[PDB]
Design a protein around this ligand. Sequence first.
Ligand SMILES: CCCCCCCCC
Lengths: 60, 74, 74, 40, 52
Amino acid sequence: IKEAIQSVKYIAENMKAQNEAKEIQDDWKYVAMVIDRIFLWVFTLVCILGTAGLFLQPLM
Amino acid sequence: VLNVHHRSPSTHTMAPWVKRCFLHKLPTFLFMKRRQDVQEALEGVSFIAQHMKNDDEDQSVVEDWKYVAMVVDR
Amino acid sequence: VLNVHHRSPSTHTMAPWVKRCFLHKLPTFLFMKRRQDVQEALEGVSFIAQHMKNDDEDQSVVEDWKYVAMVVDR
Amino acid sequence: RQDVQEALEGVSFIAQHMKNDDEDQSVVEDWKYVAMVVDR
Amino acid sequence: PSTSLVIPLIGEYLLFTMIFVTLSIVITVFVLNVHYRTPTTHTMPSWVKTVF
Ligand SMILES: CCCCCCCCC
């Protein structure tokens, strides 16, 4: 009788713990997305600067 | 078009222009057409219901992102 | 090292030597550091809770296999 | 009383659903083990 | 030819692009290691909460 109510309490605590772990995993994914974006901008600027200064500019 | 497939509500947020453009105009244009112990128990069951409703909302938004990627692909 | 990552609790048994070697000593050596209608409803809720407990145990064992793979990799 | 009756049917349906799900998981683990034996 | 006096601009461009694409794969293996990471195997630091 009380065992079923304690089991529902256990189910609620398990779902809360799984939700908190998924929050931590979303934070780990978001920091990787941030590193991905900063290196996208850095290598886009380096690629345009290299193809300008090394390929077209002396060759004109 | 592969990047807009894996967008989730925990990372991105769907802008209203990509709400209203890639779901209504172009799918119709490209032929897509879509006592004290008892008290804690009610609190736990209400928490379970809130969690399942939030999970269904997030799944609906990620299915929306998948359909947007499908429309851009076509 | 990719075979030991995909070892499940249902098909393999973790031996005590990999327990004592690849879980305790080497993660410190390599700087890792980790009423007949009513009565069946209660029995059903008890079965659901016990099955979620078994699922949590098997998930812990498969994450332990993943950590052993990570230690061998480093 | 009519509102009380459907919740017990819901709990029994959830129990039967999870039992069928566990049987399907056991059968697919059996298929995985057959693949493992043939590979070895 | 194999004249070592001066280097061509196109060979310099090929070497440049190979160096930066190799640095791109050594970055992308790091971001794949950062992505697939769980709280049951790693603890998240404090300075990464403010910077990244
Ligand atoms: C009291 C019924 C709870 C049912 C929980 C089911 C959870 C499915 C993820």
